Amino acid sequence: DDDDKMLAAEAANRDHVTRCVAQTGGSPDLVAHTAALRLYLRVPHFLTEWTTDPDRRAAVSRALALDIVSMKLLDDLMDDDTGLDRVELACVCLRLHLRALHELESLARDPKAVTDILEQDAVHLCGGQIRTKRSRATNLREWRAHASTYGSTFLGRYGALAAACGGEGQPADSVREFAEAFAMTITMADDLTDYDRNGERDGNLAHLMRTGAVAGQDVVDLLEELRGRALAAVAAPPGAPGLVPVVHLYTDDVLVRLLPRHLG
Amino acid sequence: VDDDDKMLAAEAANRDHVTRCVAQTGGSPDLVAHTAALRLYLRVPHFLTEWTTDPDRRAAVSRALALDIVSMKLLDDLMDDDTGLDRVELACVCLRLHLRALHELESLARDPKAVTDILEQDAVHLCGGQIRTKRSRATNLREWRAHASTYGSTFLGRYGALAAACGGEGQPADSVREFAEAFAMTITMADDLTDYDRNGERDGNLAHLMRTGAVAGQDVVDLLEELRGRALAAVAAPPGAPGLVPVVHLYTDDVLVRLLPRHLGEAGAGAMATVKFKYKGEEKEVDISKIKKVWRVGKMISFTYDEGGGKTGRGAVSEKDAPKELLQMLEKQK
Ligand SMILES: CCCCCCCCCO[C@@H]1O[C@H](CO)[C@@H](O)[C@H](O)[C@H]1O
Ligand SMILES: CCCCCCCCCO[C@@H]1O[C@H](CO)[C@@H](O)[C@H](O)[C@H]1O
Ligand SMILES: CCCCCCCCCO[C@@H]1O[C@H](CO)[C@@H](O)[C@H](O)[C@H]1O
Numbered sequence: 001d002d003d004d005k006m007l008a009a010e011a012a013n014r015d016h017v018t019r020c021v022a023q024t025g026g027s028p029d030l031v032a033h034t035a036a037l038r039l040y041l042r043v044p045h046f047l048t049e050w051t052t053d054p055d056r057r058a059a060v061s062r063a064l065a066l067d068i069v070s071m072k073l074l075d076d077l078m079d080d081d082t083g084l085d086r087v088e089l090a091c092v093c094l095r096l097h098l099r100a101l102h103e104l105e106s107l108a109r110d111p112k113a114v115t116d117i118l119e120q121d122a123v124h125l126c127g128g129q130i131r132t133k134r135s136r137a138t139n140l141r142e143w144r145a146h147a148s149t150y151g152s153t154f155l156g157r158y159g160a161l162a163a164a165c166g167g168e169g170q171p172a173d174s175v176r177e178f179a180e181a182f183a184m185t186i187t188m189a190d191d192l193t194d195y196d197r198n199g200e201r202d203g204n205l206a207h208l209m210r211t212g213a214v215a216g217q218d219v220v221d222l223l224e225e226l227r228g229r230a231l232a233a234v235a236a237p238p239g240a241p242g243l244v245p246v247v248h249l250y251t252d253d254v255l256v257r258l259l260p261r262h263l264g
Numbered sequence: 265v266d267d268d269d270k271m272l273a274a275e276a277a278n279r280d281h282v283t284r285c286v287a288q289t290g291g292s293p294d295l296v297a298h299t300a301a302l303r304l305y306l307r308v309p310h311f312l313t314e315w316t317t318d319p320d321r322r323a324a325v326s327r328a329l330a331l332d333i334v335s336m337k338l339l340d341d342l343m344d345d346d347t348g349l350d351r352v353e354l355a356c357v358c359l360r361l362h363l364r365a366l367h368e369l370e371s372l373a374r375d376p377k378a379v380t381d382i383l384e385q386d387a388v389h390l391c392g393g394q395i396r397t398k399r400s401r402a403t404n405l406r407e408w409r410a411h412a413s414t415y416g417s418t419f420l421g422r423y424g425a426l427a428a429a430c431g432g433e434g435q436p437a438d439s440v441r442e443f444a445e446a447f448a449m450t451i452t453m454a455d456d457l458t459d460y461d462r463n464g465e466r467d468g469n470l471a472h473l474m475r476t477g478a479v480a481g482q483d484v485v486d487l488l489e490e491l492r493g494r495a496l497a498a499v500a501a502p503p504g505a506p507g508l509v510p511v512v513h514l515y516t517d518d519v520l521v522r523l524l525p526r527h528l529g530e531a532g533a534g535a536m537a538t539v540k541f542k543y544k545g546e547e548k549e550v551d552i553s554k555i556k557k558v559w560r561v562g563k564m565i566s567f568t569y570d571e572g573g574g575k576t577g578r579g580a581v582s583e584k585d586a587p588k589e590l591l592q593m594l595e596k597q598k
């Protein structure tokens with residue numbers, strides 16, 4: 001079945017990454033940390049679901065996993081909250097990033113697309129990240145705007161990328177619309193998921209919900225808007241019907257299990 | 265007075281390109297100032313682009329290279345967290361710059377995959393090297409030179425490799441890179457022996473081991489001379505970049521004249537200077553440090569010196585057998 005395929009890609013992606021981190025000098029502690037980024041290693045699978053060839057699909061999924069983890073380490077490096085070596089973080093981050101550009105470029109119909117896609121909205125992504133951390137959100141409007149950069153544009157670039165290294169007949173705008181909508185659903189999920197790991201403060205949105213600054217129904221509505229946006233994206237021909245239940249799994253998880261944890 | 269102009273121009277060009285970029289992306293006036301303060305970093309893309317016959321390709325490559333070098337410096341500052349700068353801005357401006365760097369370099373590259381190829385060839389060597397460099401402080405010239413070969417030579421070598429790759433025709437890849445690796449270690453020593461007092465900034469590893477006697481002034485001198493030669497040669501390789509010759513001497517001699525002395529002493533490197541002569545059937549050897557009066561008669565240098573107690577000794581040698589230290593005391597006195 002399909003869950004079988006997702007589980008295998010996740011394990012292939014995980015191994016491609018930890019092997020890479022280990023051979024560049026990352027300690028057992030950082031290797032385990034990259035292996036703990038489950039959704040980050042899984043999402044590249046959903047992102048390459050319009051890729052016909054299984055071999056090309058596995059190569060693109062992992063190349064993308066290499067850069068997603070890389071950017072996620074960059075993030076942990078700017079926050080300094082993981083208690084992981086500052087040096088190993090930077091070093092591994094750059095190493096994984098260079099490996100990803102290399103693999104992705106060798107799979108792209110045209111190597112220049114990789115960097116065109118990366119530069120296209122780099123300012124949007126980076127400046128938004130600066131904006132986001134600079135000022136907390138005070139209501140759903142601001143949260144959502146901050147989230148379309150660290151969440152949506154971030155994932156959206158990888159969608160664009162998968163389309164571009166995913167061979168022929170990949171509806172590029174559609175893979176990206178899925179990427180950005182899905183990214184926001186899981187970004188909320190994480191913001192609302194507390195793990196108790198050290199100096200990890202309440203997730204902004206979760207706080208806004210418990211404070212009352214953000215309306216419960218309003219979150220529900222956004223969730224629904226994001227489910228529709230993604231279902232529409234995967235319905236567009238040629239289609240990726242296989243992502244349909246995935247969109248539902250994640251959107252329904254936040255509605256059923258995460259929201260009740262924050263009704264303030 | 266004309267090349268120095270081209271350099272001054274590339275340096276401002278590169279600076280403006282980088283600061284304009286850091287600002288558009290959101291960095292605070294602090295970080296825009298900091299990147300601006302990276303003089304050498306912004307300037308060196310000029311020397312790497314010296315084999316580029318077409319001036320516009322050159323301006324373009326020089327600045328792309330500037331963007332990445334600064335980006336990499338920012339990531340280093342980000343791992344040290346000693347700058348006082350905001351980590352978020354550092355990280356974000358870091359990535360932004362690098363992405364812009366990638367795009368611009370690939371646009372001028374001879375082959376679509378050259379850039380990512382170069383950047384990947386020795387990523388593990390540079391990245392794993394950086395981790396070792398920082399986990400263990402060096403303790404002898406040998407260990408310093410090995411650390412420096414990665415965060416200095418390897419680091420700048422890639423930018424050399426990239427300069428040749430995006431620099432049109434007439435680029436001797438290997439030479440460009442060997443220049444970069446040699447020159448890089450030179451300025452890296454210079455940075456190391458240069459103190460600035462900003463924050464809790466460490467005396468440079470090498471300057472420390474030098475003031476501790478763990479490293480020999482003459483050895484440092486030798487190493488600089490090795491790097492000056494390695495460089496000079498790389499710029500001699502046809503088609504050649506005659507223009508980097510004065511540049512090579514400029515920086516090398518700077519470390520020798522100004523920097524080295526701040527860490528050694530009254531006695532530079534090597535051994536003390538001596539005069540060897542034959543006096544009253546004897547064989548004498550005097551330290552120029554003991555030579556009092558010294559004058560010239562024909563092609564003979566006659567002198568007097570301190571021979572123990574209030575005992576005044578004399579001598580005379582052909583100018584040919586006179587050490588440069590003595591031959592100078594002539595000009596001080598006459
Ligand atoms: C991921 C690319 C799209 C951007 C949205 C980021 C959401 C990722 C959240 O996933 C979860 O993150 C936790 C900590 O961040 C991990 O403890 C957990 O194992 C992982 O499953
Ligand atoms: C993650 C890969 C690491 C690549 C980035 C390394 C930084 C490149 C330049 O090195 C610089 O050398 C100077 C001279 O010693 C130091 O004063 C300075 O701090 C350091 O920035
Ligand atoms: C060029 C990358 C290769 C690494 C070799 C180190 C050269 C960089 C040293 O230059 C100087 O660094 C200082 C930071 O400590 C700045 O304050 C100063 O203005 C700048 O001119």
Ligand SMILES: CCCCCCCCCO[C@@H]1O[C@H](CO)[C@@H](O)[C@H](O)[C@H]1O
Pocket residue numbers: 071072074075076125126129150151154187190191355356359
């Ligand atoms: C310089 C631009 C870098 C963009 C940032 C790339 C990483 C994006 C993932 O964001 C993640 O969002 C989660 C949900 O809120 C947080 O739990 C987590 O801490 C944070 O890592």
